Enzyme design. Structure first.
Site, short mmCIF file in Angstrom:
data_model
loop_
_atom_site.label_atom_id
_atom_site.label_comp_id
_atom_site.label_asym_id
_atom_site.label_seq_id
_atom_site.Cartn_x
_atom_site.Cartn_y
_atom_site.Cartn_z
N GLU A 1 5.40 -2.67 -1.73
CA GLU A 1 4.43 -1.71 -2.25
C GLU A 1 3.13 -1.74 -1.43
OE1 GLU A 1 2.96 -2.49 -6.15
OE2 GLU A 1 2.13 -0.48 -6.46
N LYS B 1 4.14 6.97 -8.41
CA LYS B 1 4.21 5.96 -9.46
C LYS B 1 3.86 6.54 -10.83
CE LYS B 1 2.84 1.12 -10.17
NZ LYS B 1 2.25 0.01 -9.36
N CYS C 1 6.90 -0.58 -8.31
CA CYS C 1 6.31 -1.72 -9.00
C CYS C 1 6.41 -1.65 -10.53
CB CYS C 1 4.85 -1.90 -8.59
SG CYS C 1 4.27 -3.63 -8.79
#
Lengths: 293, 294
Positions: free
Chosen positions: A44, A116, A153
């Protein structure tokens, strides 16, 4: 249908330029060491420090590199003819940013972008200040090596996200991550944190009959504001599991090129054995749309 | 404080309904002598019976006629030992209509609630869709004097959606009476992978929801009465308890066993402050969960 996956797990090198050049060197090393590699996944925010350790608007200046980062990693993907997943910092508009993973096809073209969706917010992980939550939803990205269920993540703690990717035909789940421990944490807590991080993702693989790749960075990174003494120690331990949650490869907590050969064709056999998708009681899943009841 | 002192009775089928339930009653008595603080006892799935879904034979619907007698028997047990007791029974709802129904008895023997298995499997040797109408009550926790129980049954435990819905409705613990074993055809690697996946997915429910979890299972070899499946099913026991971080609190063998675990429900507050998954769920983009496939 095979995915020969390479994971580039490394530290931030002190500047954007040095870090991306280091990643480029590791990609070249990875393809000499493992010539069949057709998919490379980065960690990430791979060009940058984990700048969410503090809440400081100066770090939005890093958003100005998005197009240059894409050009850099686009060229890498074409040069080595691999599908390449970078985890970048997208400037959507003035004052508007996303945590955005970008997938490069082997000719350098952009196969897709994922913003995300779940944004964390804890001391040392002040991501909600920087990243506007994604607005495209959970959509897989089609590439020459398969339909990629790519998330980022914190997304990896949500069974809902993996399931939606699977329902949309994802053939593999992928999560570039940035996860580490604080100096305050005991050995028992660190082991439990890392084991839970592994375990929840193995469940996504099992629930959906899909293999899964999780990547992570390494190294100690200090808080530039000085609020968190001892900063964040990123524990690496990138890993790959198959459609039954079984480990195919597991990395150390040091810099590493992780390699795994993933047979997508096992999903049919696994789902015939465990037909979870056939039996889901979607007629009673409505309450998943509630914050709480 | 808010503690659950959990006992799990993991045993084999004893050849008849009568012998099996009496064996359970004796084990329950042993458990409370060894662990006097026990306030919750969880039995294995279909605890009075063989795993009769190994074959598809309508005569086993005759076992549905014991539902009230089974409830009376385990009600009296819960009252005798003053524990909350979870039995996994075979409900005849009407002529031609049956459910796999777990029943929760309060410490006074009254029925705190009933859960009808929602997800019904159908694999060779696990022909459950033939017998069990899928539950129609949904995913509702059951309120008891020892806490709000997110109780589901066996195959439900492979579905994160069900565990999540229980958690969203205030379940303080997730509980799954199960019947899972391996076939003679399975290799040791396949057997190990199956059992590890079964544990692993349930630990993920605990982690995702910040809730402790109990999984129970039977033991013993059970042969296919029709003779179709050579070697029958070997139920591997391995009942276990994990806490809100997915960490093991107790794990059983593959033999008959009384498994005991002390579970602190108040830990859920600190765990969710640390891992605030519920705060961050993107429910505005979860609508596609309602589709079979897309």
């Amino acid at each position: 249908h095979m995915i020969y996956a390479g994971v580039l797990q490394h530290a931030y090198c002190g500047s954007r330029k040095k870090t991306i050049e280091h990643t480029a060197n590791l990609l070249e090393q990875a393809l000499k060491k493992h010539p069949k590699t057709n998919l490379v996944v980065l960690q990430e925010l791979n060009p940058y420090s984990y700048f969410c350790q503090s809440e400081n608007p100066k770090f939005f200046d890093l958003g100005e590199y998005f197009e240059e980062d894409k050009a850099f990693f686009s060229a890498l993907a074409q040069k080595f003819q691999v599908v390449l997943i970078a985890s970048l910092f997208e400037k959507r508009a003035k004052g508007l940013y996303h945590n955005s993973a970008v997938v490069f096809e082997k000719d350098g073209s952009i196969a897709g972008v994922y913003r995300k969706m779940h944004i964390p917010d804890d001391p040392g992980f002040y991501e909600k200040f920087y990243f506007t939550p994604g607005d495209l939803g959970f959509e897989p990205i089609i590439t020459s090596v398969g339909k990629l269920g790519l998330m980022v993540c914190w997304d990896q703690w949500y069974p809902e996200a993996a399931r939606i990717m699977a329902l949309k035909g994802a053939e593999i789940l992928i999560y570039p991550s940035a996860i580490g421990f604080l100096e305050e944490d005991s050995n028992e807590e660190k082991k439990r944190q890392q084991n839970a991080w592994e375990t929840i993702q193995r469940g996504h693989a099992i629930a959906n009959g899909l293999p899964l790749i999780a990547t992570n960075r390494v190294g100690v990174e200090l808080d530039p504001s000085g609020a968190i003494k001892g900063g964040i120690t990123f524990f690496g331990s990138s890993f790959v599991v198959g459609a039954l949650g079984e480990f195919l490869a597991k990395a150390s907590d040091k810099e590493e090129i992780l390699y795994a050969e993933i047979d997508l064709e096992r999903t049919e056999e696994v789902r015939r054995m465990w037909p979870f998708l056939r039996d889901r009681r979607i007629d009673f899943y409505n309450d998943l749309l509630k914050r709480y009841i």
